[PDB]
Design an enzyme around this catalytic site. Sequence first.
Site, PDB file in Angstrom:
ATOM      1  N   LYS B  77     -31.822 -93.340 -36.280  1.00 37.46           N
ATOM      2  CA  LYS B  77     -31.152 -92.997 -35.024  1.00 37.46           C
ATOM      3  C   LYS B  77     -30.437 -94.220 -34.515  1.00 37.46           C
ATOM      4  CE  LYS B  77     -33.052 -91.948 -30.915  1.00 37.46           C
ATOM      5  NZ  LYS B  77     -34.002 -91.090 -30.150  1.00 37.46           N
ATOM      6  N   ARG B 121     -37.535 -84.584 -27.913  1.00 42.93           N
ATOM      7  CA  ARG B 121     -38.708 -85.195 -28.480  1.00 42.93           C
ATOM      8  C   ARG B 121     -39.414 -86.142 -27.514  1.00 42.93           C
ATOM      9  NH1 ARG B 121     -37.869 -90.797 -28.067  1.00 42.93           N
ATOM     10  NH2 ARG B 121     -37.046 -91.750 -29.989  1.00 42.93           N
ATOM     11  N   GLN B 149     -33.750 -87.507 -18.701  1.00 44.95           N
ATOM     12  CA  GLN B 149     -35.069 -87.330 -19.300  1.00 44.95           C
ATOM     13  C   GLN B 149     -35.994 -86.522 -18.400  1.00 44.95           C
ATOM     14  OE1 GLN B 149     -35.340 -88.090 -22.500  1.00 44.95           O
ATOM     15  NE2 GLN B 149     -33.255 -88.906 -22.144  1.00 44.95           N
ATOM     16  N   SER B 210     -33.633 -95.590 -14.924  1.00 48.06           N
ATOM     17  CA  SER B 210     -32.772 -96.673 -15.372  1.00 48.06           C
ATOM     18  C   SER B 210     -32.928 -97.927 -14.550  1.00 48.06           C
ATOM     19  CB  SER B 210     -31.343 -96.232 -15.385  1.00 48.06           C
ATOM     20  OG  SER B 210     -30.975 -95.754 -14.116  1.00 48.06           O
ATOM     21  N   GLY B 234     -39.567 -94.777 -19.127  1.00 46.15           N
ATOM     22  CA  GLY B 234     -38.405 -95.666 -19.118  1.00 46.15           C
ATOM     23  C   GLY B 234     -38.665 -96.812 -20.090  1.00 46.15           C
ATOM     24  N   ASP B 236     -35.936 -99.668 -22.404  1.00 46.83           N
ATOM     25  CA  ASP B 236     -34.645-100.092 -22.862  1.00 46.83           C
ATOM     26  C   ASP B 236     -34.621-101.550 -23.166  1.00 46.83           C
ATOM     27  OD1 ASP B 236     -33.889-101.007 -19.971  1.00 46.83           O
ATOM     28  OD2 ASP B 236     -34.054 -98.817 -19.749  1.00 46.83           O
ATOM     29  N   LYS B 240     -37.993-104.850 -19.061  1.00 47.74           N
ATOM     30  CA  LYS B 240     -37.934-103.689 -18.169  1.00 47.74           C
ATOM     31  C   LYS B 240     -39.289-102.997 -18.080  1.00 47.74           C
ATOM     32  CE  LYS B 240     -36.814 -98.936 -17.662  1.00 47.74           C
ATOM     33  NZ  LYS B 240     -35.400 -98.778 -17.319  1.00 47.74           N
TER      34      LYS B 240
HETATM   35  N1  LIG Z   1     -38.803 -92.259 -25.894  1.00 44.15           N
HETATM   36  C1  LIG Z   1     -38.586 -92.876 -24.774  1.00 44.15           C
HETATM   37  O1  LIG Z   1     -39.559 -93.356 -24.101  1.00 44.15           O
HETATM   38  C2  LIG Z   1     -37.211 -92.761 -24.235  1.00 44.15           C
HETATM   39  C3  LIG Z   1     -36.239 -91.889 -24.805  1.00 44.15           C
HETATM   40  C4  LIG Z   1     -35.026 -91.686 -24.089  1.00 44.15           C
HETATM   41  C5  LIG Z   1     -34.797 -92.448 -22.947  1.00 44.15           C
HETATM   42  N2  LIG Z   1     -35.718 -93.327 -22.494  1.00 44.15           N
HETATM   43  C6  LIG Z   1     -35.489 -94.123 -21.308  1.00 44.15           C
HETATM   44  O2  LIG Z   1     -35.789 -93.367 -20.127  1.00 44.15           O
HETATM   45  C7  LIG Z   1     -35.038 -93.983 -19.033  1.00 44.15           C
HETATM   46  C8  LIG Z   1     -34.187 -92.946 -18.338  1.00 44.15           C
HETATM   47  O3  LIG Z   1     -33.251 -92.321 -19.240  1.00 44.15           O
HETATM   48  P1  LIG Z   1     -32.341 -91.102 -18.724  1.00 44.15           P
HETATM   49  O4  LIG Z   1     -31.709 -90.554 -19.966  1.00 44.15           O
HETATM   50  O5  LIG Z   1     -33.091 -90.163 -17.859  1.00 44.15           O
HETATM   51  O6  LIG Z   1     -31.240 -91.924 -17.872  1.00 44.15           O
HETATM   52  P2  LIG Z   1     -30.387 -91.301 -16.613  1.00 44.15           P
HETATM   53  O7  LIG Z   1     -29.401 -92.372 -16.244  1.00 44.15           O
HETATM   54  O8  LIG Z   1     -30.024 -89.887 -16.885  1.00 44.15           O
HETATM   55  O9  LIG Z   1     -31.477 -91.152 -15.442  1.00 44.15           O
HETATM   56  C9  LIG Z   1     -32.108 -92.315 -14.902  1.00 44.15           C
HETATM   57  C10 LIG Z   1     -32.328 -92.136 -13.394  1.00 44.15           C
HETATM   58  O10 LIG Z   1     -33.142 -93.184 -12.915  1.00 44.15           O
HETATM   59  C11 LIG Z   1     -32.744 -93.414 -11.564  1.00 44.15           C
HETATM   60  N3  LIG Z   1     -33.302 -94.661 -11.124  1.00 44.15           N
HETATM   61  C12 LIG Z   1     -32.855 -95.927 -11.366  1.00 44.15           C
HETATM   62  N4  LIG Z   1     -33.665 -96.829 -10.741  1.00 44.15           N
HETATM   63  C13 LIG Z   1     -34.631 -96.129 -10.154  1.00 44.15           C
HETATM   64  C14 LIG Z   1     -35.767 -96.440  -9.306  1.00 44.15           C
HETATM   65  N5  LIG Z   1     -36.073 -97.717  -9.022  1.00 44.15           N
HETATM   66  N6  LIG Z   1     -36.500 -95.432  -8.851  1.00 44.15           N
HETATM   67  C15 LIG Z   1     -36.207 -94.140  -9.098  1.00 44.15           C
HETATM   68  N7  LIG Z   1     -35.143 -93.784  -9.822  1.00 44.15           N
HETATM   69  C16 LIG Z   1     -34.349 -94.719 -10.330  1.00 44.15           C
HETATM   70  C17 LIG Z   1     -31.220 -93.367 -11.659  1.00 44.15           C
HETATM   71  O11 LIG Z   1     -30.522 -93.222 -10.439  1.00 44.15           O
HETATM   72  C18 LIG Z   1     -31.044 -92.176 -12.572  1.00 44.15           C
HETATM   73  O12 LIG Z   1     -30.877 -90.920 -11.949  1.00 44.15           O
HETATM   74  C19 LIG Z   1     -34.215 -95.084 -19.680  1.00 44.15           C
HETATM   75  O13 LIG Z   1     -34.956 -96.299 -19.600  1.00 44.15           O
HETATM   76  C20 LIG Z   1     -34.072 -94.631 -21.106  1.00 44.15           C
HETATM   77  O14 LIG Z   1     -33.718 -95.638 -22.026  1.00 44.15           O
HETATM   78  C21 LIG Z   1     -36.901 -93.504 -23.104  1.00 44.15           C
HETATM   79  N1  LIG Z   2     -32.582-107.500 -29.282  1.00 43.69           N
HETATM   80  C1  LIG Z   2     -33.945-106.970 -29.549  1.00 43.69           C
HETATM   81  C2  LIG Z   2     -34.122-105.609 -28.852  1.00 43.69           C
HETATM   82  C3  LIG Z   2     -35.278-104.750 -29.310  1.00 43.69           C
HETATM   83  C4  LIG Z   2     -35.118-103.277 -28.824  1.00 43.69           C
HETATM   84  C5  LIG Z   2     -35.484-103.093 -27.348  1.00 43.69           C
HETATM   85  N2  LIG Z   2     -35.848-101.684 -26.901  1.00 43.69           N
HETATM   86  C6  LIG Z   2     -34.136-106.900 -31.073  1.00 43.69           C
HETATM   87  O1  LIG Z   2     -33.206-106.600 -31.838  1.00 43.69           O
HETATM   88  O2  LIG Z   2     -35.227-107.221 -31.581  1.00 43.69           O
END
Ligand SMILES: NC(=O)c1ccc[n+]([C@@H]2O[C@H](COP(=O)([O-])OP(=O)(O)OC[C@H]3O[C@@H](n4cnc5c(N)ncnc54)[C@H](O)[C@@H]3O)[C@@H](O)[C@H]2O)c1
Ligand SMILES: N[C@@H](CCCC[NH3+])C(=O)O
Lengths: 357, 347
Positions: B77, B121, B149, B210, B234, B236, B240
Site C-alpha cells: 500500500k 479495514r 475514519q 489529524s 490517529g 501518521d 503524533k
Molecule cells: N490504521 C490506522 O490506525 C489508520 C488508518 C487510516 C488513517 N489513520 C489516521 O487516522 C487519523 C484521521 O484520519 P482521517 O482519514 O479521519 O482524517 P480526516 O482529515 O478525514 O479527519 C480528521 C479529523 O480530525 C479533526 N481533528 C484534528 N485535530 C483534532 C483535535 N485536537 N480534536 C478533535 N478533532 C481533531 C479534524 O478537524 C478532522 O475532521 C490520521 O492520523 C490518519 O493518518 C490511521
Molecule cells: N520517515 C520514517 C517514517 C515512518 C512511518 C511513520 N508512520 C521512516 O521512513 O522510517
Amino acid sequence: RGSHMETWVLGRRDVAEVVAAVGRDELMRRIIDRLTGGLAEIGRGERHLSPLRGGLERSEPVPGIWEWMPHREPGDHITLKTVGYSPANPARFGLPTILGTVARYDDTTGALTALMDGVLLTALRTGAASAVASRLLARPDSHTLGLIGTGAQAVTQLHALSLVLPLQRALVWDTDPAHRESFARRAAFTGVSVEIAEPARIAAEADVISTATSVAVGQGPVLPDTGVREHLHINAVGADLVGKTELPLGLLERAFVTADHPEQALREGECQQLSADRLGPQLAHLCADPAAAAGRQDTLSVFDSTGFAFEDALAMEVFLEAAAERDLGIRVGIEHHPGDALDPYALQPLPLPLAAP
Amino acid sequence: METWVLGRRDVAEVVAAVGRDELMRRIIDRLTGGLAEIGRGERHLSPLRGGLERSEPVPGIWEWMPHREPGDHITLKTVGYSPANPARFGLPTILGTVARYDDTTGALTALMDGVLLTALRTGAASAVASRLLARPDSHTLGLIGTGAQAVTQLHALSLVLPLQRALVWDTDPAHRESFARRAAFTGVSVEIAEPARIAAEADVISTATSVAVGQGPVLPDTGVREHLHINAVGADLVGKTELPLGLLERAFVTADHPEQALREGECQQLSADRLGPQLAHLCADPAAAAGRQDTLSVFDSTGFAFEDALAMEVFLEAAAERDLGIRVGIEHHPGDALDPYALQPLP
Ligand SMILES: NC(=O)c1ccc[n+]([C@@H]2O[C@H](COP(=O)([O-])OP(=O)(O)OC[C@H]3O[C@@H](n4cnc5c(N)ncnc54)[C@H](O)[C@@H]3O)[C@@H](O)[C@H]2O)c1
Ligand SMILES: N[C@@H](CCCC[NH3+])C(=O)O
Ligand SMILES: NC(=O)c1ccc[n+]([C@@H]2O[C@H](COP(=O)([O-])OP(=O)(O)OC[C@H]3O[C@@H](n4cnc5c(N)ncnc54)[C@H](O)[C@@H]3O)[C@@H](O)[C@H]2O)c1
Ligand SMILES: N[C@@H](CCCC[NH3+])C(=O)O
C-alpha cells in the site's frame, strides 16, 4: 486537484510507441543528458540523493529481492519504483529477471498521477548511468568493451557506451552458454562487433568493462584479478542482495572508485569490500566538476553502480514528455476521491436503470 | 499476463452489490482469522512501514507499506496523509492505492483504490479489538475526530457492539455538525459532546484525529468509567499522539504492531515494557482479553500492510465474481527476456 482527477497510465504499447517515434539512439541520448544534468545538480548541492532503497528478499526459486525506491522532489512529486530481481525468471518463466513499474504521486496531495512500465526505463537509465560515468572515467579513444553477464542489462550497457565511446568490438562472457551465444543477435542493432571471450581474456584486452550478472551472494568474483590494461575503467552494475559482489578485491583496492550513491554502495555495491575512506568522489560530484576525476582515465577506475530512484524519476520525465507530445496512454480513476472528502462511503456507482423490466 | 486494475467505479460497484454491512463483516472476519494466524505463529507481522515527511502545505507524510506472503504475493500500500486535503482540494486526507505483486516473479498482478479499503479495514481492526476488550453491553460510543475514519469506526463498532448512541467531537465545527448525516446509515444516534463529557460517559471511544505533533491531547487527563475501552487510531508522523499520558499509563495497552506502535503509536509515550500483549495474541487466545473488559484498556492502532492484504483479497473475490475491473498491460514483458528492446510489434 479536485476529486475529479485520475491517473495517467502508460502501458507496454505506449512505451513501445515512444521508442518507435523517438528512436532507440535518441531516447538513450535524452536519458544520458537528463541524468548528467540531474546528477550535476546533486553535486552542486541543489538536490539530494534518494533515501536508501529497501526490499524483501525471497529465496525461491533462486534468491532474489523485491524492492521499493522512493524519491521526493519537494513541492512537486514523489517517484516510486517498485522492482523485482528474480534471476530464474528468464529460464523458468520467459520473463525478464528485472520486472518493475514506476509511479508518480503528487507531493502536495499524495494523489497517484502517473504509472508506467519500469522494465524498459530501468534498462535505459542503467546503461545511461554507465555512460555518464564512462564518458568521465574511460579513455575517450576506448575501442574494446568487455561484458561479463550478457543478459538484459548487457544490451543497454553496450548501447549506452557505444553512444559516448568509439567502440568497435565487444568481448563477452556469461556462465550460461545459451545467453552468451545469443548476445551477438541482441547486440546487432549497435553495429558493434561481438566476440565470445573468457573472463581472463576480457580483463587483459578491454578498455572498458561492464559487469552485470545474476551471480549469487558470496559467489564472486566474476572477473579474475589476472592482469588488466592500465587505463581500464569498469562499471560494476550487478546489484541486488546484500552480500553480492562481482569484482576481485585486489583490483578494487588499487582502483579509483566512484559510487553512484555512496551509502548505498557501501551496503550493496562493490564498496561492500572497501572502507568508506577509500572511496573517491561520488558520481554526482564528478558530474558537477568533471576535474575531480582528473587523470583517472589513464589509471584503473571503477564506477560502482547500484541504481537509485532519482535516476528513475529523471528517465520517467523523459518518457512522460515524449508521451504527452504524442497523446499516449490512458486515464483511469484508480483512487477513490469521494464527493464528500470526509465520507469514505460517498462512492458513485453506475446509476440504476429507470425503465420497467 | 496483464495487470488487473480495480478503480473507484469497480470499488463502488462492489459496495453496491455486496452492501456496506456485509462488506464490513467480511473484512472483520478475514482480519480476525488472519490476526489469529499471526498469534499462532502461522503468519507474521509486516515489516515496519516507511515514509517521506512533507512540511507543506501542513505537515504530512507519504508512506509505503509492504507485506509478503512467501510463495504467494507481495502487497504494497502506498498512502498519503495530507490533512489540508479536504478543505483545500476537496480530497480526503488519506489518499492511497494497493498493489499486488507475484512473489515468485515480481510481476504486478493487481492494482486498486486504497481509500475505501483503508477506511474499512481500519474500522474493522477497531471492531476486532473492541469485541475483545470492550464490555459486551457497551451502549455509548465516543468519537474524537469526526472526519473520514470516524465514519468507519462507527460503522464497524455498530456491527459488533450494541451501541445506542455516539457522542462526538471535532475541533472543526463544520466537521462535527456534518457527522450525523454521514452516520445516519448506521442507525446509531449522534450527539455532539465536548471531550470531557465523552471521556466521562463513553463505554468505548475511538480517537481518529489529524492532530499535529505537539498538539492535543484530544481528551482531557480525566476520570473515566472503570471499563472504558479506547481505540487510539490517529497515526501518521513520528511524534503524533492523542491520549493523555496519565490515562495511558494506567491502561492495559494492546498494539496492533508493537514495534510500529512504539514508533508512531500512543506507545511512543511509554517504555517498551509497558506494552501488553499484541492484538494477534488476544485473537489467538481471547481468554487473555476477557479480564480486561472491566478495567481501562487501550488498543493502539497504527495500521499495517497485512490488514490491507486481507481487505484487498475480500475485494478481489467480490470483483472476480462479478467480473469487475479492467486488464492493462503495464509492465513490458519482452518477447526475448534478455532483450529489453524487444518491444515488437511497433504501433
Ligand atoms: N490504521 C490506522 O490506525 C489508520 C488508518 C487510516 C488513517 N489513520 C489516521 O487516522 C487519523 C484521521 O484520519 P482521517 O482519514 O479521519 O482524517 P480526516 O482529515 O478525514 O479527519 C480528521 C479529523 O480530525 C479533526 N481533528 C484534528 N485535530 C483534532 C483535535 N485536537 N480534536 C478533535 N478533532 C481533531 C479534524 O478537524 C478532522 O475532521 C490520521 O492520523 C490518519 O493518518 C490511521
Ligand atoms: N520517515 C520514517 C517514517 C515512518 C512511518 C511513520 N508512520 C521512516 O521512513 O522510517
Ligand atoms: N545498477 C543498477 O542500476 C541496476 C539496474 C538493473 C539491474 N541491475 C542488476 O544487474 C544484474 C543483471 O541484471 P539483468 O537484468 O541483466 O539480469 P539477466 O538475468 O537478464 O542477466 C544476468 C546474466 O548473468 C549471468 N551470470 C550469472 N552468474 C554469472 C557469472 N558468475 N559470470 C558471468 N555471468 C553470469 C546469467 O547467466 C545471466 O545471463 C542484476 O544484479 C540486477 O539486479 C542493476
Ligand atoms: N532487506 C534490505 C535490502 C536492502 C536493499 C538491497 N538492494 C532492506 O530493506 O534494507
